[PDB]
Structures are given as structure tokens and as C-alpha cells.
Structure 1
Amino acid sequence: SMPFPKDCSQAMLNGDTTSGLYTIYLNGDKAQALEVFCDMTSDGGGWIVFLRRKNGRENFYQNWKAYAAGFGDRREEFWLGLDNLNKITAQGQYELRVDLRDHGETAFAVYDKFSVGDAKTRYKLKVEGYSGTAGDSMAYHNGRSFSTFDKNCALSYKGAFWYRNCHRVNLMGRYGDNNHSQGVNWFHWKGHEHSIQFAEMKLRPSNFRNL
């Protein structure tokens, strides 16, 4: 086992094949512990989950400081934090996976390259190299800074995201809200008048597939 695994891929290879809460260590530093939910089952596992929507119990209409730090219950609905995502994605080349489920239908998107810049970039999104069944709805968002109501699409749609003008992905939108562009949307799968029941965003090293 690795003593200070830097992501859920290093924590998995530690043999641990059950999804749930694990400690990772940013940059392998024992003083930078972070509790994360590891999805150890989806497409070979090793995924740090950083967003989960499943029941509408948690409020995602939150401010910059909340999006920077993270909020919620890692075992249920939560947001890991942009500062965490920046520090994880700085460690190497990561891939993004998005898992969606709504009334029994499932879809996914993988982006071979995923990074989140630091606070001086307003946590700029990079997403490249799409494959999947959900449809490439993140391309629209590529290179955009993060937006909250206090730093306007966030205000106008009551969510938070790497907004442009405004969105094709709104996974931090209002749960069960089928009003145009208000809900948990992935436009190229279910459009803007269909709020998705279940959504996860997760990351792991892009080289995991052949390590």
C-alpha cells in the first residue's frame, strides 16, 4: 500500500476495492489530508467523486467561498471544493468522468484531459478529449472561469458553474426544476426542460486505464 495516496487511484491499488470514504493526501503530503468519496466500481474505479446530486436535500445555490472550500455530505449530495480540485488536478494529468441517471436511463461522458486552475484563474476549467453517450456538453464550457452569484448566469439560473452565456451543463442547478435552464441539466442528453435525478462528476489519472 502507499502511505499517503494522492487520489482514489493510489488508494485503490492499495487493494481497497469498496466505494466509500478514503483519506487522500494532496501532493502525497501527510499534512494535506482530505477525506474523499472514492467510486471504486465505475469503469475500473479509482475515481474521486467531486459532485453528487441524487435527492435535492442539499442547497447548491451557494457563494464563492462555499464553492472554493466545498460543502455537503460526501456520502450524499456534496461539492468537493474548487481549491481541492485545483490541487488534485495540479498533481498530474487527470481525466473527468460524468455519470448521469434519470428514470432508469444512464449516460456518461469522459474527458481525457481535465484540470481546474487556481484562484488567480477564478478556477478556470480545462476539458478536452470527449468520449461517451451523454453528448459533449462540456465543450461549450471549456476555458471558462467559475461563477457564483457573488463573483450573471449563477444569479439568473440560481446555481454555480463554469458559466459562459450561460450553460449546456448545469449539474449544480436546482434539483427537480424542469423550468428552462433552471435544473440539473446536461443539454445534449436531456435538454434544458428536464432536471436529471442523479449526477456524479469524478476524476482520476488519465493513465489509470493502462497503469
Structure 2
Amino acid sequence: SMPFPKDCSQAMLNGDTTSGLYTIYLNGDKAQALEVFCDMTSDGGGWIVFLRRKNGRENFYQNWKAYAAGFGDRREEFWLGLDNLNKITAQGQYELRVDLRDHGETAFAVYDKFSVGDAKTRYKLKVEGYSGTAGDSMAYHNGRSFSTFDKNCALSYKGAFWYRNCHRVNLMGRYGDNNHSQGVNWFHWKGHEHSIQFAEMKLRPSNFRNL
């Protein structure tokens, strides 16, 4: 019903309730088509998934240009791209949800306010307004620029993130690596010596809860 939906909340309200690949249009512009994976089932649906870890098949030890542009298989392990995340989060007030699952246990984190700055900010993270069960591990990272090995936390832990000194969240770390701080970590859920089997990061308009 919305011809050029700008996110997965506008694609869902279009009656599409099946999780999978949808076209969104940044700023509603039919010339800024982007293929995204929509999670239409987790807490009301309408989520753009921008990170998925689930089997270790994809390499996340990738350079600045790869993190800027995105990589992987949207149906499996992928990173959507920082330029995409900046352009999406510029369209309105968005909320971040993180879904975690490991050996049958689940946890989540929601941040009422989530934004990614442009390349001039080195894609600065904003995350505020925590609730959930995983523990607030992103607060540590709030206001940090993105880091890759070629722009050293990324090099030392062989991943990429809004690193500080160095992390409480390492969802782009080495799959199944339980060595301290090397793996897919969410520190305030499973610490630094437990790599998480399944992880998704996703966003939708913060006002979706009552739209």
C-alpha cells in the first residue's frame, strides 16, 4: 500500500507479515532501492536486520570499505553496511533490537534511540534508552566511531565494531571462538570467554510500538 516503503515497518504495514527479503527505498526515493531482510515476527515485526551470526560460514574480519558497503548473504550471515545504516537512521527516530540465542537460551536488548553518523563521523554510534534481558552492553560503546583493522582493537580481536578499549559487545567477532574477547560476545549476558551461537541486530522506527 506504501509504494516506496523507507524501512521494514512501512513494508509490514503493507500487510507483508512473512520474514524475508523486501525492497526499501531510502528517504522514500524510488532511485534509492535497497534489498533488506525484514524480521516480521520478533516483538511486533517491521525490523530491518543489519547483522546476522548463526554458523560461522561468513568472514567478518573485513576492511573499512567492506563495513561501509556491506557484505554476505542477507538470508544467512551478513552485515548490511554502515552507509545504509547512516541513511536509514537519518530518516527518523529508530530503535535498535539485538536478539541473542546460545544453546537454547535467549536474551534481547532494545535501545529506544539508535543512530549511525555519516563517514565524516566515522559512522559514530548513538545508543540510548536500554531495556531487556541481555544486559546493557552497548552503553560502553555509546558515542564511539566504527573501527576496522585498516582504520588496535579490530586487529587484536580480529573483528570490527564501535570499539573503545576494547569491547563489551563483539557481535562481528570470530565465530565459535571462546578465547577471551575473540568471539561473538555480549559481555553482560555470557562474558568474554563464551562465543554466542546466534546474534541479530535490527532496527525500526522507535514510534512503531504505538503507530
The TM-score, its normalising length taken from structure 2, stands at 1.00
Q: Deviations over 1:70-117 (max 9, x none)?
A: 000000000000000000000000000000000000000000000000
Q: Deviations over 1:51-73 (max 9, x none)?
A: 00000000000000000000000
1:155 aligns with 155
SS at match of 1:181: coil
SS at match of 1:87: helix
Distance 1:62 1:200 in 2: 18
Tell me the CA shift for residue 182 of structure 1.
0.1
Runs of 4+ in 1 over 2 A off after TM superposition: none
Tell me the CA shift for residue 167 of structure 1.
0.0
Distance 2:15 2:73 in 1: 25
Q: Deviations over 1:12-55 (max 9, x none)?
A: 00000000000000000000000000000000000000000000
Distance 2:6 2:152 in 1: 35
Task: Trace 1:15-54 onto structure 2 (pairs within 5 A).
Answer: 15-54=15-54
Distance 1:169 1:70 in 2: 19
Distance 1:170 1:151 in 2: 17
Q: Deviations over 1:139-174 (max 9, x none)?
A: 000000000000010000000000000000000000
Distance 1:67 1:54 in 2: 19
Distance 1:29 1:165 in 2: 39
- In structure 2, stretches of 5+ residues that fail to align are none
SS at match of 1:112: strand
SS at match of 1:65: helix
How big is the alpha-carbon RMSD for the aligned residues of Structure 1 and Structure 2? Answer: 0.1
Distance 1:128 1:78 in 2: 25
SS at match of 1:155: helix
Identity %: 100
Task: Trace 1:56-71 onto structure 2 (pairs within 5 A).
Answer: 56-71=56-71
Distance 1:148 1:190 in 2: 24
Matched, 1:79 2:95: no
Distance 1:89 1:203 in 2: 9
Distance 1:33 1:156 in 2: 36
The TM-score, its normalising length taken from structure 1, stands at 1.00
Distance 1:101 1:16 in 2: 26
Tell me the CA shift for residue 179 of structure 1.
0.1
